[PDB]
Amino acid sequence: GRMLPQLVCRLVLRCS
């Protein structure tokens, strides 16, 4: 995984 399964939800946290 990593940078794929959370690339979206993180996207939120991408900007976190």
Q: Please, could you describe this protein's structure?
A:
By secondary structure, this protein is an all-alpha fold. Helix content is 50%, strand content 0%. The chain is built from 1 helix and no strands. It has one helix at 7-14. The PDB classes it as surface active protein. The entry lists the keywords lung, surfactant, SP-B, surface active protein. It forms a monomeric assembly.
Ends apart, CA distance between termini? 20 Å
What order do the SSEs take from the amino end to the carboxyl end, as H and E? Answer: H
The number of helical elements comes to 1
Structural class: mainly alpha
How many strands, what sense, and barrel or not for the largest sheet? Answer: none
Helix fraction by DSSP (H/I, runs of at least 4): 40-55%
Rg on CA atoms, Å: 7 Å
Please provide the count of β strands. Answer: 0
Task: Quote the beta fraction.
Answer: under 5%
Shape: elongated
What would a concise description of this structure say?
It is classed as surface active protein. The chain has 16 residues and is mainly alpha-helical.
